[PDB]
């Protein structure tokens, strides 16, 4: 099931019972994927959106939809599509989780600072919903992390993972192209039984998306 806005810029699609994928188009419309986790104690998002207007609109949508508060957001890296709505998060009392490095880079890029609480391996539980954040090393950016939902074996790769039709790695000015391969290998070694994989943008797939990205990096 999918739910969008009248303009069509914001869409939310259900993966399973309590897991949805939020997608926003940043204008040439450029999409960005994130997750919406419906828990017994509120809504949790994996990544915000391009800017504050889109992020606020996204939050307004899911809150109206599930009739609950978005309590936390996990930021996967310090770029606009991930941390663009940080000001909106902070003004609404939404906890913006991130690694210390992501917080450092957010500041450098002119964004308000996220919590910087996430360690290399951080397990978070919101109600019955379990979430694991993992820093696999440098790739798309120096700070990129992945998110794992152990109850569903769902992997949110962020921009470290490209979609099936993607033949372009995207912006590599802040990337560590050579190390990117080792980082993907660390994700593969850590999670031996992956089901669905959500790329930074594009359609949800499986472990084959990680192999595809390694192919592009060759
Ligand atoms: Zn980026």
Can you put this structure into words, describing what you see?
It comes from Bacillus cereus. Its EC number is 3.5.2.6. Keywords: Antibiotic resistance, Hydrolase, Metal-binding, Periplasm, Signal, Zinc. With 218 residues, the chain is α+β, with helices and mostly antiparallel strands. It has a single domain, classed as Metallo-beta-lactamase, Chain A, CATH 3.60.15. The protein has helices spanning 52-66, 80-83, 86-91, 100-108, 177-190, 208-217; strands spanning 2-4, 10-14, 19-26, 30-39, 42-46, 70-74, 95-97, 121-126, 129-134, 146-149, 154-158, 197-199. The strands form 2 sheets. A 7-stranded mixed β-sheet has the order 1-2-3-4-5-6-7. A 5-stranded mixed β-sheet has the order 8-9-10-11-12, with no helix packed on it. Strand 8 (121-126) and strand 9 form a beta hairpin. Helix 5 (177-190) runs antiparallel to helix 6. The chain is globular and about 45 Å long. The N and C termini lie far apart (37 Å). The chain binds zinc ion. Zinc ion (ZN) binds at residues 77, 79, 140-141, 159, 171. Zinc ion is lined by residues 77, 79, 140-141, 159, 171.
List keywords for this structure.
monomer; 218 residues; alpha+beta; Metallo-beta-lactamase, Chain A; seven-stranded mixed β-sheet; five-stranded mixed β-sheet; globular; binds zinc ion; hydrolase; beta-lactamase; antibiotic
What is the top-level CATH class?
Alpha Beta
Major beta-sheet overview: 7 strands, mixed
CATH topology: the name is Metallo-beta-lactamase, Chain A
Query: Structural class per helix/strand content?
Result: alpha+beta
Distance between the termini: 37 Å
Q: Which strand order spans the largest sheet, edge to edge or round the barrel?
A: 1-2-3-4-5-6-7
What's the CATH H-level superfamily name?
Ribonuclease Z/Hydroxyacylglutathione hydrolase-like
> What string gives the helices and strands in order?
EEEEEHEHHEHEEEEHEH
- List the ligand species: zinc ion
Radius of gyration: 16 Å
PDB class: hydrolase
Keywords: hydrolase, beta-lactamase, antibiotic, metalloenzyme
Assembly: monomeric
Entry title: metallo beta-lactamase II from bacillus cereus 569/H/9 at PH 6.0, trigonal crystal form
């Amino acid at each position: 099931t999918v739910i969008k806005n009248e303009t069509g810029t914001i869409s939310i699609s259900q993966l399973n019972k309590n897991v949805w994928v939020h997608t926003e188009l940043g204008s040439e419309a450029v999409p960005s994927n994130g997750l919406v986790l419906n828990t017994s104690k509120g809504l949790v998002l994996v990544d915000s959106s391009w800017d504050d207007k889109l992020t606020k609109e996204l939050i307004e949508m899911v809150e109206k939809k599930f009739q609950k508060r978005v309590t936390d957001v996990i930021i996967t890296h310090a770029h606009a599509d991930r941390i663009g709505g940080i000001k909106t998060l902070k003004e609404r009392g939404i906890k913006a989780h991130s690694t210390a490095l992501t917080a450092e880079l957010a500041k450098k890029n002119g964004y308000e600072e996220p919590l910087g609480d996430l360690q290399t391996v951080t397990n978070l539980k919101f109600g019955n919903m379990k979430v694991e954040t993992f820093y696999p090393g440098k790739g798309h950016t120096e700070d990129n992390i992945v998110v794992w939902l152990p109850q569903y074996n769902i992997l949110v790769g962020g921009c470290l993972v490209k979609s099936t039709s993607a033949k372009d790695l995207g912006n590599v000015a802040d990337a560590y192209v050579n190390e990117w391969s080792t980082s993907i290998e660390n994700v593969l070694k850590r999670y031996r039984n992956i089901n669905a994989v959500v790329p930074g943008h594009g359609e949800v797939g499986d472990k084959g998306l990680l192999l595809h990205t390694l192919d592009l990096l060759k």
